[PDB]
Design a protein around this ligand. Sequence first.
Ligand SMILES: *[C@@H]1O[C@H](CO)[C@@H](O[C@@H]2O[C@H](CO)[C@@H](O)[C@H](O)[C@H]2NC(C)=O)[C@H](O)[C@H]1NC(C)=O
Lengths: 55, 171
Amino acid sequence: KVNGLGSRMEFSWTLLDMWDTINFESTGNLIAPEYGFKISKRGSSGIMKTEGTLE
Amino acid sequence: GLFGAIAGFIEGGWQGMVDGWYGYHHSNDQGSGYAADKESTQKAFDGITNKVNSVIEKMNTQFEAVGKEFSNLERRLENLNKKMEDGFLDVWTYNAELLVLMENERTLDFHDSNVKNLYDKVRMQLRDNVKELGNGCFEFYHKCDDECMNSVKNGTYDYPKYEEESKLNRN
Ligand SMILES: *[C@@H]1O[C@H](CO)[C@@H](O[C@@H]2O[C@H](CO)[C@@H](O)[C@H](O)[C@H]2NC(C)=O)[C@H](O)[C@H]1NC(C)=O
């Protein structure tokens, strides 16, 4: 029991292409999304690992 | 050091010579005078700046390591990444440092060569109207004005003017 739970939720993802249709169908256990994340600004960014804060 | 002017036959520097890197000191009647050469010091400035600009212009590529994260099931991949980053790192360290060491040598040698070349310019200009003492100074066999002096420092010296005069005072 992690976090007081013996059950799990296993998430997976995808990049939905422009003008393509995604299809969800399930007879149970589907944690469906309500949102999708459109890519509004592509650009060379990064993820920095720090414990600090932005000044 | 390699051309043996600096810390060589010209044993030490001139703390009063501060209008340039190299130059003259004439001690006639009219006065004394630490007075920097123009041509040689300029050319030496142009060379060096050209050099360091050619050093900062050589290690300027990009961009990021893009920084990647790996599973507890892809530890060869993670290490391959690591091995290739450290790898390049070491290469660019060596390259930067060796370049530094080498261009430092060549720089000091360049000043040395510069000075010697100057002293050789003056010596072969004067010829035998003087005593090559070998402290890097010359002793005249005639009277040299703030006018004959300031004619040597700009490349113009009528040898056969003072030829007979100096031949006389020599003997
Ligand atoms: C899903 O939606 C998109 C956008 O409406 C559809 O793309 C269009 O398809 C029609 C007919 O196939 C074409 O006339 C248009 O040219 C398409 N739009 C553009 C701008 O490319 C797509 O066909 C739809 N697919 C489904 C599953 O109905």
